[PDB]
Design an enzyme around this catalytic site. Structure first.
Site, PDB file in Angstrom:
ATOM      1  CB  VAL A  27      42.412  50.293  23.310  1.00  0.00           C
ATOM      2  CG1 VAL A  27      42.922  49.210  24.254  1.00  0.00           C
ATOM      3  CG2 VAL A  27      43.578  51.014  22.631  1.00  0.00           C
ATOM      4  N   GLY A  28      39.650  51.401  22.098  1.00  0.00           N
ATOM      5  CA  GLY A  28      39.033  52.695  21.751  1.00  0.00           C
ATOM      6  C   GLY A  28      37.900  52.559  20.750  1.00  0.00           C
ATOM      7  N   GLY A  30      37.853  52.167  17.464  1.00  0.00           N
ATOM      8  CA  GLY A  30      38.080  53.036  16.298  1.00  0.00           C
ATOM      9  C   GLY A  30      38.449  54.485  16.649  1.00  0.00           C
ATOM     10  CE1 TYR A  32      40.600  57.014  22.631  1.00  0.00           C
ATOM     11  CE2 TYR A  32      41.392  54.838  23.212  1.00  0.00           C
ATOM     12  CZ  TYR A  32      40.683  55.980  23.536  1.00  0.00           C
ATOM     13  OH  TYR A  32      40.057  56.117  24.734  1.00  0.00           O
ATOM     14  N   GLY A  33      42.040  55.719  16.199  1.00  0.00           N
ATOM     15  CA  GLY A  33      42.642  55.083  15.006  1.00  0.00           C
ATOM     16  C   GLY A  33      42.926  53.602  15.254  1.00  0.00           C
ATOM     17  CB  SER A  34      45.022  51.050  13.474  1.00  0.00           C
ATOM     18  OG  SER A  34      44.134  51.060  12.406  1.00  0.00           O
ATOM     19  CB  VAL A  35      45.411  52.589  19.093  1.00  0.00           C
ATOM     20  CG1 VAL A  35      46.151  52.613  20.419  1.00  0.00           C
ATOM     21  CG2 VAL A  35      45.734  53.822  18.274  1.00  0.00           C
ATOM     22  CE  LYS A  50      47.528  57.280  14.875  1.00  0.00           C
ATOM     23  NZ  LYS A  50      47.571  58.735  15.127  1.00  0.00           N
ATOM     24  CG  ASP A 165      45.064  66.021  17.250  1.00  0.00           C
ATOM     25  OD1 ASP A 165      43.980  65.504  16.988  1.00  0.00           O
ATOM     26  OD2 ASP A 165      45.470  67.042  16.714  1.00  0.00           O
TER      27      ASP A 165
HETATM   28  C1  LIG Z   1      50.073  55.552  20.162  1.00  0.00           C
HETATM   29  C2  LIG Z   1      49.865  57.030  19.907  1.00  0.00           C
HETATM   30  C3  LIG Z   1      50.352  57.621  18.735  1.00  0.00           C
HETATM   31  C4  LIG Z   1      50.003  58.914  18.364  1.00  0.00           C
HETATM   32  C5  LIG Z   1      49.156  59.680  19.170  1.00  0.00           C
HETATM   33  C6  LIG Z   1      48.951  61.173  18.976  1.00  0.00           C
HETATM   34  O1  LIG Z   1      48.450  61.864  19.878  1.00  0.00           O
HETATM   35  N1  LIG Z   1      49.351  61.710  17.805  1.00  0.00           N
HETATM   36  C7  LIG Z   1      49.360  63.152  17.535  1.00  0.00           C
HETATM   37  C8  LIG Z   1      50.741  63.728  17.880  1.00  0.00           C
HETATM   38  C9  LIG Z   1      50.935  65.247  17.874  1.00  0.00           C
HETATM   39  C10 LIG Z   1      50.085  66.099  18.806  1.00  0.00           C
HETATM   40  C11 LIG Z   1      50.459  67.594  18.684  1.00  0.00           C
HETATM   41  C12 LIG Z   1      49.717  68.482  19.686  1.00  0.00           C
HETATM   42  C13 LIG Z   1      49.903  67.989  21.096  1.00  0.00           C
HETATM   43  C14 LIG Z   1      49.444  66.536  21.223  1.00  0.00           C
HETATM   44  C15 LIG Z   1      50.202  65.641  20.253  1.00  0.00           C
HETATM   45  C16 LIG Z   1      49.001  63.392  16.059  1.00  0.00           C
HETATM   46  N2  LIG Z   1      47.743  63.139  15.693  1.00  0.00           N
HETATM   47  O2  LIG Z   1      49.856  63.819  15.270  1.00  0.00           O
HETATM   48  C17 LIG Z   1      48.644  59.105  20.341  1.00  0.00           C
HETATM   49  C18 LIG Z   1      49.014  57.814  20.741  1.00  0.00           C
HETATM   50  N3  LIG Z   1      48.363  57.102  21.774  1.00  0.00           N
HETATM   51  C19 LIG Z   1      47.086  56.854  21.946  1.00  0.00           C
HETATM   52  O3  LIG Z   1      46.323  56.822  20.983  1.00  0.00           O
HETATM   53  C20 LIG Z   1      46.632  56.372  23.280  1.00  0.00           C
HETATM   54  C21 LIG Z   1      47.308  56.148  24.495  1.00  0.00           C
HETATM   55  N4  LIG Z   1      46.511  55.674  25.434  1.00  0.00           N
HETATM   56  N5  LIG Z   1      45.294  55.574  24.826  1.00  0.00           N
HETATM   57  C22 LIG Z   1      44.175  55.083  25.566  1.00  0.00           C
HETATM   58  C23 LIG Z   1      44.043  53.701  25.736  1.00  0.00           C
HETATM   59  C24 LIG Z   1      42.981  53.211  26.479  1.00  0.00           C
HETATM   60  C25 LIG Z   1      42.065  54.079  27.038  1.00  0.00           C
HETATM   61  C26 LIG Z   1      42.198  55.444  26.853  1.00  0.00           C
HETATM   62  C27 LIG Z   1      43.256  55.977  26.110  1.00  0.00           C
HETATM   63  C28 LIG Z   1      43.373  57.466  25.914  1.00  0.00           C
HETATM   64  C29 LIG Z   1      45.335  55.976  23.540  1.00  0.00           C
END
Ligand SMILES: Cc1ccc(C(=O)N[C@@H](CCC2CCCCC2)C(N)=O)cc1NC(=O)c1cnn(-c2ccccc2C)c1
Length: 341
Positions: A27-28, A30, A32-35, A50, A165
């Site tokens: 999904v995404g 690229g 969202y990264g590797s998701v 991820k 994020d």
């Molecule tokens: C698996 C996962 C793993 C890590 C993250 C993620 O946000 N990591 C953050 C965490 C810390 C951050 C601190 C401030 C407050 C917010 C959090 C980071 N960069 O460190 C997201 C997902 N999930 C997704 O990427 C995700 C979940 N549905 N979708 C999606 C899927 C289809 C369509 C649309 C969307 C948005 C994408």
């Protein structure tokens, strides 16, 4: 004891996960990264999985991996992404080289929602309320997002919102960034995130990027045109000589009347924008104060806007070797307790 894993190739990427997770679909594109979207045979729910990219390749990668796991393990709030599971195929510290993180699967990011048209005032009330509820929680733990923009906010069909994020992975950050943390010209606090919310709210109401700067110099010029050049009172609090020289070298702009900019909007929405888009970061409204603004009369409940447990960020000061950051990460994988079903 320990589950059974299965292997896969997806977009030139190897994936090794427990059988519990089925029908993995990238999904995404690229962003969202590797998701992958996956089906969780244990709960009957869709999830997102991820795979971290080269997690222990350098000291800086290894610290970033530890930081992302620690933040995700902390977050327990309806309006912030949370951790459903974390796993590695490794049976020991020695062979530990891969980290997989599992969250809820969301329906859309807010970037590919504004792209259609503007929202109704009622839709804007509900979405900004939920952003501010999540920010009161994050800010209570002394955590700052620092990169709030429409592409990091996700919603379901019922318009329930979560803060995420997507880090470095391919809408300019520049367009949403607080003037003080962009040009590093003043003490900066949690209210850098409130500037970003102001920019996002404007965009949901008008259907247009509020400050589409081409670079840092263009960006500041667009900002000062709306909010006016700093007064002698804010100039007194600027520590950078080069910043102070630059500002005082522009010809003076007045603050515009926001009612004349956001013409036809809910006057309660215009008032809240005036309180968020102030240059002086000591005078900007906080998340907790914004939740009690009249604009959110329909949604505000002071007994259901919780704070967070304290978060130990002492690790942020430390300078350790790859194998040390790796061992600390392994400890957090081992100690993980899933959320109650
Ligand atoms: C698996 C996962 C793993 C890590 C993250 C993620 O946000 N990591 C953050 C965490 C810390 C951050 C601190 C401030 C407050 C917010 C959090 C980071 N960069 O460190 C997201 C997902 N999930 C997704 O990427 C995700 C979940 N549905 N979708 C999606 C899927 C289809 C369509 C649309 C969307 C948005 C994408």
């Amino acid at each position: 004891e320990r589950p059974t894993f299965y292997r896969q190739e997806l977009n030139k990427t190897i994936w090794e996960v427990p059988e519990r997770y089925q029908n993995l679909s990238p999904v995404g594109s690229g962003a969202y990264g590797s998701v992958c979207a996956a089906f969780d045979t244990k709960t009957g729910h869709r999830v997102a999985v991820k795979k971290l990219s080269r997690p222990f390749q350098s000291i800086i990668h290894a610290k970033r991996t530890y930081r992302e796991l620690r933040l995700l393990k902390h977050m327990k709030h309806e309006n912030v992404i949370g951790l459903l599971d974390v796993f590695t195929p490794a049976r020991s510290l020695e062979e530990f080289n891969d980290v997989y993180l599992v969250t809820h699967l969301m329906g859309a990011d807010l970037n590919n929602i504004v792209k259609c048209q503007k929202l109704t005032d009622d839709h804007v009330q509900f979405l900004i309320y939920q952003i501010l509820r999540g920010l009161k929680y994050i800010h209570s733990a002394d955590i700052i997002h620092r990169d709030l923009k429409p592409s990091n906010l996700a919603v379901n069909e019922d318009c329930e919102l979560k803060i995420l994020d997507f880090g470095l992975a391919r809408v300019a950050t520049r367009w949403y960034r607080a003037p003080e943390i962009m040009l590093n010209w003043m003490h900066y606090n949690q209210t850098v995130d409130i500037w970003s919310v102001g920019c996002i709210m404007a965009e949901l109401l008008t259907g247009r990027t509020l400050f589409p700067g081409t670079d840092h110099i263009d960006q500041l010029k667009l900002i000062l045109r709306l909010v006016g050049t700093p007064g002698a009172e804010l100039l007194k609090k600027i520590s950078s000589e080069s910043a102070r020289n630059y500002i005082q070298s522009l010809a003076q702009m007045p603050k515009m009347n926001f009612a004349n900019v956001f013409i036809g909007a809910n006057p309660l929405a215009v008032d809240l924008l005036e309180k968020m888009l102030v240059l002086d970061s000591d005078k900007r409204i906080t998340a907790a104060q914004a939740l009690a603004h009249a604009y959110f009369a329909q949604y505000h409940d002071p007994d259901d806007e919780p704070v967070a447990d304290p978060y130990d960020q002492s690790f942020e000061s430390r300078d350790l070797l790859i194998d040390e950051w790796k061992s600390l990460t392994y400890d957090e994988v081992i100690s993980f307790v899933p959320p109650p079903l």
